[PDB]
């Protein structure tokens, strides 16, 4: 979850739209979102930032 938040930070810094696929492209195991709190953390980080 911590790397998920950090990756969404880094992706939103450059202005590119942070989506699930784009974040997955920057993970060693782009399948961790099947856990139902990694996705929750990603959604919370996006919604705090305004998506």
């Amino acid at each position: 979850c911590s790397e998920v938040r950090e990756i969404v930070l880094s992706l939103n810094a450059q202005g590119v739209y942070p989506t699930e696929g784009r974040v997955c492209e920057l993970m060693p195991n782009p399948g961790c979102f099947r856990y139902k709190q990694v996705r929750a953390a990603f959604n919370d980080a996006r919604r705090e930032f305004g998506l």
Binding site: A13, Y17, R47, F49, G50, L51
Partner: protein, 343 residues
């Protein structure tokens, strides 16, 4: 005195040009329109639309800026108690690059200008797309549908509650394809102004007259204000134009004050009585005079930066049609009373 300060003669030509550009004349027409518009804004009382008709160069935009400034000044004392409350927000309609006016872009830009006081306040609109960024500017994703943007704008407008919503160049709302009724695009704004409760002031030229009276609902919730030019038939308007010209001549930053009232016919001919056009003409002539470092204004110098006869004829034709459409006489009142059966 009543003229420009004499210290400006030693200042560079740029300073004199800036001073003349910033100068504003309080001629009777602008004053009266200002009082009527601010009285309407102070209390709309059911009306949702304000139509400020006028020619090109009468001074509609400067009137809007003056009204915005004075509204902000009046809301400054009350802003200390109730925060997150925009006093006035104003945008300009965009002439579309396609055959239809883009409502999505209108909503996006209205949201951008309205919801940018500063970063200290957050509202958390009900739609996911709209958000701020690291630069402090609102960016709206292209995937946000138009009804969602409309709902977000409605929520933001309800929260902020500006006194009036200015829409400059409202004649661009008439850019529709064949078979599309102009009434529908007016109800599109009327519904927003009704479910939101924010007065909308539409400023535009005589092309805005196509939105004058489209339905009974749109005629009830509308205030009609005519920014009128100066005519040559009535001696009072001629005297007002001469007074404005004399005031302009006193406030022209030149070493020797030019004589400018005597050539009042030539000015009215190429200006059509609009103070904005005359101000632009005098600004151009003053810039040329300072470019050569002249000491006065000569008739040929005015002849240089004068609008062509064809341009003036076109503007006068549209002014004639607009004034004919907007003329109210006792015959119309009597016909209305006879139709109402009030004899």
């Amino acid at each position: 005195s009543t003229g420009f300060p004499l210290e400006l003669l030693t200042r560079p030509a740029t300073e004199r040009l800036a001073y003349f550009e910033n100068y504003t004349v309080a001629h009777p027409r602008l004053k009266e329109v200002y009082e009527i518009l601010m009285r309407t804004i102070a209390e709309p009382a059911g009306a949702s639309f304000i139509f400020v008709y006028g020619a090109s160069g009468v001074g509609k935009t400067t009137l809007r800026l003056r009204v915005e400034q004075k509204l902000t000044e009046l809301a400054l004392p009350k802003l200390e108690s109730d925060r997150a409350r925009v006093p006035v927000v104003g945008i300009e309609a965009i002439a579309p690059e396609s055959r239809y006016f883009n409502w999505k872009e209108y909503y996006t830009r209205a949201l951008i200008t309205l919801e940018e006081p500063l970063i200290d306040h957050k509202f958390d609109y009900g739609v996911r797309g709209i958000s701020r960024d690291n630069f402090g500017k609102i960016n709206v994703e292209s995937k946000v549908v138009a009804p969602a943007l409309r709902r977000a704008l409605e929520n933001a407008l309800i929260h902020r509650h500006p006194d009036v919503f200015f829409v400059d160049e409202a004649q661009h709302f008439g850019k529709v394809a064949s078979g599309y009724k102009l009434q529908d695009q007016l109800d599109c704004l009327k519904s927003l102004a009704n479910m939101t409760g924010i007065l909308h002031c539409l400023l535009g030229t005589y092309e805005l007259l196509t939105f004058r009276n489209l339905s009974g609902q749109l005629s009830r919730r509308s205030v009609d204000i005519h920014f009128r030019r100066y005519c040559a038939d009535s001696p009072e308007d001629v005297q007002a134009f001469k007074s404005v010209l004399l005031t302009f001549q006193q406030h022209l930053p030149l070493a020797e004050t030019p004589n400018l009232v005597d050539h009042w016919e030539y000015f009215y001919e190429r200006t059509l009585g609009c103070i904005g056009t005359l101000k632009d003409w005098l600004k151009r002539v003053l810039s040329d005079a300072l470019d050569r470092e002249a000491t006065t204004i000569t008739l040929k110098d005015l002849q240089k930066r004068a609008l062509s006869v064809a341009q003036c004829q076109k503007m006068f034709k549209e002014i004639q049609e607009g004034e004919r459409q907007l003329s109210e006489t006792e015959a119309d009142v009597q016909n209305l009373r006879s139709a109402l059966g009030l004899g």
